[PDB]
Amino acid sequence: MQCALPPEFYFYTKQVIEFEETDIRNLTLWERTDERHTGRVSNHAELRVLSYFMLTINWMLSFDRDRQYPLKWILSLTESLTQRTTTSESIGRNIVKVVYPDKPTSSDYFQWSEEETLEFLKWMEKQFLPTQTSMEMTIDQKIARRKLYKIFPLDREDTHQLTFIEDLQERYAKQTPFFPPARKEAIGRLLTHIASQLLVDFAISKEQLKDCISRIKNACLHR
DNA sequence: CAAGTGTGAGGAAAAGTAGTTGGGTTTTTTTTGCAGTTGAAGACA
């Protein structure tokens, strides 16, 4: 559902997981890495789930001999994907993007699709209200501060935006027209995007993620 | 191509502390009336 919720891809990736993903067994949380150097044993189950997820997509889309997934179909999904508001979720992912990290969302900062800009300032006026409460900077200082905020009344000197499954539905429809070198390029293009998404919620390692990817790649070819 | 021991530093923050200054009393070490009086210069016998 996260994106190209290809209903079939749930069972695809569940199957490869079925496959060599811990001898077709639900990944359990790794162990009590007692040692202090915390090596990348890479046993964090999810990290591998996302890896199988990614792999599945391109393997699945990189050998859909029957041509079940049309050339022009793959980019359409990536297309429709091209960001968009979020019945709360995508707005959230913007808020996480804004921890100014490795610059994958930094520019989103820059762009920040109009309103996204607006509902952002809304969430700032509500949820960094706690912000704080100076005590011991002479009462006078406090008064001054109040006055300043004063002379800045501000805060106002379809309910419009939509929910999660609404957005999900509507891009599922935005692709609803379903029934060589370029597609390979498109596939790579799409995979980078998900790499962005899944990686962005998590500790990424614009390499480790990759390292993780590499790992099971190796794991797999022992058929 | 690959997994596995051993292990040093980089990093964060509130409060404190630094440096520089200034402030700061405290401190500490013009005549305008009266009547008289003395001393005075000058004269004299």
From Swiss-Prot:
Domain of life assignment: Eukaryota
Subcellular location: Nucleus, Nucleolus
Free-text function comment from the UniProt entry: Component of RNA polymerase I core factor complex (CF) that acts as a SUA7/TFIIB-like factor and plays a key role in multiple steps during transcription initiation such as pre-initiation complex (PIC) assembly and postpolymerase recruitment events in polymerase I (Pol I) transcription. Binds rDNA promoters and plays a role in Pol I recruitment. After binding of UAF (upstream activation factor) to an upstream element of the promoter, CF is recruited in a SPT15/TBP-dependent manner to form a pre-initiation complex.
Similarity-based family: Belongs to the RRN7/TAF1B family.
Further remarks about this protein from its record: Present with 398 molecules/cell in log phase SD medium.
Subunit organization: Component of the core factor (CF) complex, which consists of RRN6, RRN7 and RRN11. The CF heterotrimer may further dimerize to form a hexamer. RRN7 interacts with RRN6, RRN11, SPT15 and RRN9.
Entry domain remark: Although it shares weak sequence similarity with SUA7/TFIIB, displays a similar subdomain organization as SUA7/TFIIB, with a N-terminal zinc finger, a connecting region (composed of B-reader and B-linker regions), followed by 2 cyclin folds.
Protein's name according to its UniProt entry: RNA polymerase I-specific transcription initiation factor RRN7
Organism: Saccharomyces cerevisiae (strain ATCC 204508 / S288c)
The encoding gene: RRN7
